[PDB]
Amino acid sequence: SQIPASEQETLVRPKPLLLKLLKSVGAQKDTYTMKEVLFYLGQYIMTKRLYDEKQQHIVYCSNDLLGDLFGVPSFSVKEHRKIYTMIYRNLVVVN
Ligand SMILES: CC(=O)Nc1ccc(NC(C)=O)cc1
């Protein structure tokens, strides 16, 4: 029986600019799961300290490559659906 659709892994290849961003915080591969992309995005925001010091869910990125990739000047980590849309524009899914 096929793995339930909801359970199937989401395998992705970051487009060149997102891949450059992930490699800047240690990623060394071309292909990832969505979980791994999310891990590296967290590492990148943490390392560059793009988050608001007091309201740490809020990320400022108008003067960052992340803003050009996501197409927003800032966002909240709590915006789960929007963050997915922003990430997917920078990924090719691997069948
Ligand atoms: C470092 C870390 O915690 N990453 C992370 C968190 C939740 C999940 N869950 C599932 C079920 O994918 C996977 C990875």
List C-alpha distances in Å: 50 to 25, 64, 75: 14, 9, 11
For ligand 1, atom 3, the nearest C-alpha belongs to: 39
**Beta strand residue intervals within 1-95, DSSP E:** 11-14, 32-33, 58-60, 74-76, 91-93
Instruction: Round the CA-based radius of gyration of the chain to a whole number and report it.
Output: 14
Method by which the model was determined? X-ray
For ligand 1, say whether the CB of 80 is within 6 Å of any of its atoms: no
Q: Tell me, what amino acid is at 31? A: T
Question: Is the CB of residue 55 less than 8 Å from the CB of residue 69?
Answer: no
Minimal CA–CA distance to 9: which of 44, 43, 36, 29? 36
For ligand 1, say whether the CB of 35 is within 6 Å of any of its atoms: yes
DSSP of 47-62, one letter per residue? HHT-B-SSSTTEEE-T
| All domains in the chain, ordered by first residue | 11-93 (1.10.245.10)
**Beta 74-76 vs 91-93: how paired, if at all?**
unpaired
Q: Tell me, what amino acid is at 65? A: L
For ligand 1, say whether the CB of 7 is within 6 Å of any of its atoms: no
The Å distance, Cα 80 to ligand 1 centre, comes to 14
Q: Which two tokens stand for residue 46?
A: 């943490």
Tell me, in Å, the resolution of the deposited structure: 1.4
